[PDB]
Amino acid sequence: GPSRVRQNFHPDSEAAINRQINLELYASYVYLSMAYYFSRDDVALNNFSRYFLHQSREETEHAEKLMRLQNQRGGRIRLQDIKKPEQDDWESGLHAMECALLLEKNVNQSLLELHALASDKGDPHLCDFLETYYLNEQVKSIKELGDHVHNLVKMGAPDAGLAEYLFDTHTLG
Amino acid sequence: GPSRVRQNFHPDSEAAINRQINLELYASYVYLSMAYYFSRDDVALNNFSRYFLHQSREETEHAEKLMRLQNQRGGRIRLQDIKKPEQDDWESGLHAMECALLLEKNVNQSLLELHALASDKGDPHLCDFLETYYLNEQVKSIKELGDHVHNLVKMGAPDAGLAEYLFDTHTLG
Amino acid sequence: GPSRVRQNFHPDSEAAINRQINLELYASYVYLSMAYYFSRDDVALNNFSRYFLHQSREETEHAEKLMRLQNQRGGRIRLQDIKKPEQDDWESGLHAMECALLLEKNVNQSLLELHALASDKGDPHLCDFLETYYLNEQVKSIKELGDHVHNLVKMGAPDAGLAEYLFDTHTLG
Amino acid sequence: GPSRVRQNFHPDSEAAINRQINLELYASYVYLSMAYYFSRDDVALNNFSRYFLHQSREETEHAEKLMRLQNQRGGRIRLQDIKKPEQDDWESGLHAMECALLLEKNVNQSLLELHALASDKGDPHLCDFLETYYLNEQVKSIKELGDHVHNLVKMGAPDAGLAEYLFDTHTLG
Amino acid sequence: GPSRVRQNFHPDSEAAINRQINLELYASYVYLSMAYYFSRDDVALNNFSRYFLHQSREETEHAEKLMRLQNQRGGRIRLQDIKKPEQDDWESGLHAMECALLLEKNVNQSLLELHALASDKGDPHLCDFLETYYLNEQVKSIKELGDHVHNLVKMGAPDAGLAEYLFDTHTLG
Amino acid sequence: GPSRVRQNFHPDSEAAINRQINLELYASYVYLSMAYYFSRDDVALNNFSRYFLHQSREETEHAEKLMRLQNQRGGRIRLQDIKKPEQDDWESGLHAMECALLLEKNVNQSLLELHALASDKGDPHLCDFLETYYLNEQVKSIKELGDHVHNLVKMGAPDAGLAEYLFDTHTLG
Ligand SMILES: [Cl-]
Ligand SMILES: [Fe+2]
Ligand SMILES: [Fe+2]
Ligand SMILES: [Fe+2]
Ligand SMILES: [Fe+2]
Ligand SMILES: [Fe+2]
Ligand SMILES: [Fe+2]
Ligand SMILES: [Fe+2]
Ligand SMILES: [Fe+2]
Ligand SMILES: [Fe+2]
Ligand SMILES: [Fe+2]
Ligand SMILES: [Fe+2]
Ligand SMILES: [Fe+2]
Ligand SMILES: [Fe+2]
Ligand SMILES: [Fe+2]
Ligand SMILES: [Fe+2]
Ligand SMILES: [Fe+2]
Ligand SMILES: [Fe+2]
Ligand SMILES: [Fe+2]
Ligand SMILES: [Fe+2]
Ligand SMILES: [Fe+2]
Ligand SMILES: [Fe+2]
Ligand SMILES: [Fe+2]
Ligand SMILES: [Fe+2]
Ligand SMILES: [Fe+2]
Ligand SMILES: [Fe+2]
Ligand SMILES: [Fe+2]
Ligand SMILES: [Fe+2]
Ligand SMILES: [Fe+2]
Ligand SMILES: [Fe+2]
Ligand SMILES: [Fe+2]
Ligand SMILES: [Fe+2]
Ligand SMILES: [Fe+2]
Ligand SMILES: [Fe+2]
Ligand SMILES: [Fe+2]
Ligand SMILES: [Fe+2]
Ligand SMILES: [Fe+2]
Ligand SMILES: [Fe+2]
Ligand SMILES: [Fe+2]
Ligand SMILES: [Fe+2]
Ligand SMILES: [Fe+2]
Ligand SMILES: [Fe+2]
């Protein structure tokens, strides 16, 4: 106190990074919930399931990279409860994809606020870290999810009987 | 009489194993009937056919493993007639899948009764045999069949013209 | 009704093919019974066992090929109960081999009657099918079984202590 | 309601499986916390860190396997908040290893209670599942952790300056 | 005292495991005695010898696996004298095979009693351990030995001059 | 009686070889006891454990080679009980190594007495056998154990906290 490594690292930045770690862990848990929704016997869309499981693991990688940043900069990780997701029953392939898009946008908004704080505190290491590993990948995620929602809507999901089935097998497969 | 190998093997267990052999053979025959239904010129769903043929051969393996158990434990195999299946015309892909699910549940109920008898007779070898090779594989079968029924129902089988065709080619293919 | 494929296919032929399917399934079951007789702890002739198990699976292939014929020609498969074999205890290697020879001759007689019916109905496709895949293989089976019975008799089976043991290990091995 | 797959699956078992999923997720989070403790600049035991990170990921696999069980049996996954770990600062290599041992014993106690419930409800599938994938691996974990605690204590951790360093490099390396 | 690893491990179970270790070591020694009987100049059945030597080493593996279990569960191994086998002269191939069958049945009875104790003490880890590694392999051993005794008896051992010689070379070879 | 192979083989030599077989078996059992001491949760020196297990198996090879000698020369193996080791708790790495050194010296003394008897009976085959396979390997064993005791003593075992740990990992590893 301070860490022998710490330099140009504002306590506000340290706290905002702890908040972002919790949000990334929360996103992981939402996607895990979605993944196991799709392997229910009364849903059975295995490629939706694999899709969301892959998203869940990516979100864990995002959290861990922020944990490593906290250690590298000499901050102290403070973990909080990971809240359960808003739903256990995600209703349909389309509904899950829309919820995921909203979640990604919300996480993006949090990262942009983190970048604005980093800029305000004159922390270019932290600004570069967010630009290099977070902002770019959030834009790509939001765009992929938007594509998926569009196709599902057009195909007539969730009511058209063939739509989620064909999308599972041809886009997510 | 007794076999020089026989030990801790109740005559009731021996008889219940003979009953289970007949039931597994019967399941084999039901699936064989289903397999050749699907290769009729007026049905022509070749991947449904291959699916059920594969199930038929698995059921024979289940029967033979119980026959080997009877020999290993010093019991005497007693074969009975294998009754013909309830239908020759299985009506549709969905109807066959629903019949198969009911059959698997009925076989599962028989295996659970066998396990309860084995437990009542303090035969842990026989309990372990059922747990190791039967109970797990029945749960997986029932869950796969449930998935298949769900997708076919959702896709609009049997009346929707594309449903069984697309399921044949994309799930069972 | 009729099938759009059906041509030059007499209802009598269709019914006789259904009878032959049942007989081939029955032969399969007789050989399965024999196979598991030989792996009893008080018989223990593992190569007799493998021999009969191989015969059992061949008989299933014979049945399925007739089922496929029924579908190809536009007939409708009608399955019946598969009767249990005449014995559970097949007494000796020699006795089983003699029973198998009698069974093969009985199946051969049924196939020859099927060929005579096919000829009477001017169905050369069906005559050729039987000649190509059945008649030749039945002659070879009957001759192999006759060879086996001869050697076992000469060696002094079933009473000579070394005969079935040595035949198991040197002919069937 | 009920699921078309559900059979011999007691609502009490379904609820106890949901509780176990939460506990396995909690164990994952405790080990993640431990992993990033060890990569602090003022702790810097990289092999302790890798050790606990590996434990964290194993605990996630345990949770997911129970989620899959819930789906296979026709139960409905109900997720709850994942509570934060008891400490952010785990004090020493030895202290973390002692906390992990206590955690593993607590999880083991929960699994044994689950097995007793499964037995009481005559669910042998569920009993076998726990025996096959959980009970054995918990015993091995507890024994490994006990070995580690013993060696660290004997070597004079945490006060002896070389102990955690040498253990990091020679046992965990 | 107690071990830091010990959990749900009854002192009665610990003592019964020590008794089983001694019995497995004793079985090893009986088979070692048998192995070197068969390589006497006045017996000279080298494949009987290799057979029993292989059995001896398997029995040591069984003992060591129970020793490892004792350590894993936090019990304390207590070794006792290994009694010498009942005979130094095992009389014939058939007589040794009959003695081995009796020994295997006696060990099986001891394992079944251990399982009943484990069940009575609500130790499912210990029940699963016995089912997974012991009960199955004892049934297979007893059945193999029964097969061997049957063939030797039928062939006319021990008085028929060719019987043990031919069995040595064709079954055990 | 005598064996048709027996020549220049004194009954005293035959009896002393039986005594040596028992002693080698006893040494095997002492080392087995030591091996499983080191894998206790409260000892946990896995390389000490592997070391002693390797010694145990070597001692069995020594016993079997003497059994083969007895058969080759036309003597008759007479087995006796294998006494349990003097301790179940071997106290420390150093204490076990000192006990092993004493055991090896005691076995060496027995082999030297056997050689003196062989010489007195003018049995050069037996003298050469002991020189070729026993005396040389005992000297090497005693010297290795002496080296190990020296290093452990110098390093400050058993009280110095790092000594047995470092020796486990660097000498025995
Ligand atoms: Cl021969
Ligand atoms: Fe992604
Ligand atoms: Fe990634
Ligand atoms: Fe990725
Ligand atoms: Fe993220
Ligand atoms: Fe809440
Ligand atoms: Fe994301
Ligand atoms: Fe910038
Ligand atoms: Fe299957
Ligand atoms: Fe299979
Ligand atoms: Fe399969
Ligand atoms: Fe089955
Ligand atoms: Fe009927
Ligand atoms: Fe089945
Ligand atoms: Fe059980
Ligand atoms: Fe099991
Ligand atoms: Fe397609
Ligand atoms: Fe054949
Ligand atoms: Fe064939
Ligand atoms: Fe063939
Ligand atoms: Fe045939
Ligand atoms: Fe009948
Ligand atoms: Fe035939
Ligand atoms: Fe022809
Ligand atoms: Fe682990
Ligand atoms: Fe794993
Ligand atoms: Fe692992
Ligand atoms: Fe776990
Ligand atoms: Fe809290
Ligand atoms: Fe764990
Ligand atoms: Fe064996
Ligand atoms: Fe083995
Ligand atoms: Fe083996
Ligand atoms: Fe054993
Ligand atoms: Fe005695
Ligand atoms: Fe055994
Ligand atoms: Fe050595
Ligand atoms: Fe050696
Ligand atoms: Fe060696
Ligand atoms: Fe030795
Ligand atoms: Fe004593
Ligand atoms: Fe030695």
Structure, explained:
It is classed as oxidoreductase. Keywords: human mitochondrial ferritin, hMTF, time-controlled iron loading, ferroxidase site, dioxygen, superoxide anion, oxidoreductase. Crystal structure of human mitochondrial ferritin (hMTF) Fe(II)-loaded for 15 minutes showing either a dioxygen or a superoxide anion coordinated to iron ions in the ferroxidase site. Chain A is mostly helical and 173 residues long. In chain A, 72% of the residues lie in helices and 0% in strands. In chain A, helix 1 runs antiparallel to helix 2 (46-73), helix 1 (11-38) runs antiparallel to helix 3 and helix 3 runs antiparallel to helix 4. The radius of gyration of chain A is 18 Å and the shape is elongated. Chain A starts with 10 loop residues before the first helix and ends with a helix. Chains in contact: A-B, A-D, B-C, B-D, B-E, C-E, D-E, D-F, E-F. The interface between D and E is medium-sized, with 21 and 15 residues. The site of one fe (ii) ion has 2 residues of chain A, from helix 2.
Largest sheet of chain A: none
Q: What is the strand tally of chain A?
A: 0
Strand-and-helix sequence of chain A, N→C?
A: HHHHH
Strand content of chain A: under 5%
Regarding quaternary structure, how should these chains be classified? Answer: part of a larger assembly
Q: Which fold name is given in CATH as the topology of chain A?
A: Ferritin
Given the helix and strand composition of chain A, which structural class is it?
mainly alpha
Query: How large is the radius of gyration of chain A?
Result: 18 Å
Q: What is the largest interface, and how many residues per chain?
A: A-D, 30 and 30 residues
Euclidean distance between termini CA atoms of chain A: 51 Å
Shape of chain A: elongated
Question: By CATH's scheme, which homologous superfamily of chain A applies?
Answer: Ferritin, core subunit, four-helix bundle
In which range does the helix fraction of chain A lie? over 70%
Q: How many separate helices of chain A?
A: 5
Bound molecules: chloride ion, fe (ii) ion
> What is the total domain count of chain A?
1
In the CATH scheme, the class of chain A would be: Mainly Alpha
Name the CATH architecture of chain A.
Answer: Up-down Bundle
PDB class: oxidoreductase
Keywords: human mitochondrial ferritin, hMTF, time-controlled iron loading, ferroxidase site, dioxygen, superoxide anion, oxidoreductase
Entry title: Crystal structure of human mitochondrial ferritin (hMTF) Fe(II)-loaded for 15 minutes showing either a dioxygen or a superoxide anion coordinated to iron ions in the ferroxidase site
Chains A, B, C, D, E, F: Ferritin, mitochondrial
